Amino acid sequence: SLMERLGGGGFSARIFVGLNVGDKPTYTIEDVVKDTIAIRKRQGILPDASFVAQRGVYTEQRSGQLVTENSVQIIIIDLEGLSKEDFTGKVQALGKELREDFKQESVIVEIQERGIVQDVYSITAEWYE
Amino acid sequence: SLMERLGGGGFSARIFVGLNVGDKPTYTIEDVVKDTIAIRKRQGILPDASFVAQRGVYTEQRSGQLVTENSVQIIIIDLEGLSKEDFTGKVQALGKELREDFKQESVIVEIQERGIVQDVYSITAEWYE
Amino acid sequence: SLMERLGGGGFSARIFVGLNVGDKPTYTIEDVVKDTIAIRKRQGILPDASFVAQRGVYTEQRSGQLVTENSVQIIIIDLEGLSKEDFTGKVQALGKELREDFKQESVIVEIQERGIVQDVYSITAEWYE
Numbered sequence A, B, C: 001s002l003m004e005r006l007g008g009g010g011f012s013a014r015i016f017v018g019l020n021v022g023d024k025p026t027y028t029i030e031d032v033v034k035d036t037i038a039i040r041k042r043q044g045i046l047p048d049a050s051f052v053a054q055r056g057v058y059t060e061q062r063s064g065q066l067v068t069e070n071s072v073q074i075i076i077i078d079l080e081g082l083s084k085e086d087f088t089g090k091v092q093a094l095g096k097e098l099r100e101d102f103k104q105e106s107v108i109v110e111i112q113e114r115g116i117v118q119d120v121y122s123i124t125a126e127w128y129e
Ligand SMILES: Nc1ncnc2c1ncn2[C@@H]1O[C@H](CSCC[C@H](N)C(=O)O)[C@@H](O)[C@H]1O
Pocket: A016, A017, A018, A019, A020, A021, A022, A054, A055, A056, A057, A058, A069, A070, A071, A072, A103, A104, A105, A106, A107, A108, B048, B049, B050, B051, B075, B076, B077, B078, B079
């Protein structure tokens, strides 16, 4: 076998997507897998990724209620050697669309370069209050 | 949606908690979720976290027996902008209490700052020998 | 309890192993656990590790087909204080053997030092074309 060293700037990302809508369990990990594939295909990017099922604990921003849900940790290693701006923008757009598609108040996105965190973002719904 | 960049020094932690007591499967991931919520509430800290089910392999320290168990990886991203000392101390106290509550010989704690590991600790029972 | 700070250069690794052979679901996480234990024992290294079940999305290299499979993320924290070369070589050998044992086209290996990625490798089958 060949020991192919990955090129590029070593970008990766983690996205956390919950599966409750409010306090109601609603979605499944496979829903997130399929939606992520669909989004990334429309970006023209290699969709390859890992999806980890989790239990998540989250404090709702508006009410302060503490909720426990199933959630998904999406792990993306850039295998295409994208620029920082290209990779970051495509991951941010994916996170923003996942938030909409799953009716989420927040989606958390973490961008890394050689494992060093460049940015952690909370993508937050602007539902009118 | 709003792309809220997380503030603070970028602290996060990982805690590994096994669910065997010795070679006996005993606990579940939901037990760890509930206990973690309870501990963190008593700390006055936001409990929000992710919990990943795993299979773990561990060599017992006293006997050298190799055990395979279910285990839990707790992932904590600091969203409150705590100081290094505050966050580190609260994570260490959580790990220490989890070790007691689940009758564990070891709990592993990893503290990161912008993804760079600051400390890896094994919290080890002092059972008399 | 004792708060034992881990020594060494802080090496760790992640290995991603799929459970499809081509487009056919074939293996299970427990197969990977058992094979990893067996390999690491023959290396004379402490086998201790964590194994995370995942859903994985992968583009096949030769055909371009997009496949969704179950997969396993192996997380290895070096607790023995190995040298960089020793740890890296033993993780690479484990990844290479896992690729063979599970009839995989690719296995992904990531080596970290204090969380900073030193290398990401794709271990790729040289099946004759
Ligand atoms: N501080 C933190 N550290 C680690 N994981 C966290 C976290 N805050 C949230 N998470 C993870 O992020 C997931 C989604 S956050 C909450 C989503 C919710 N359903 C909504 O509508 O907004 C959680 O389930 C948890 O797995």
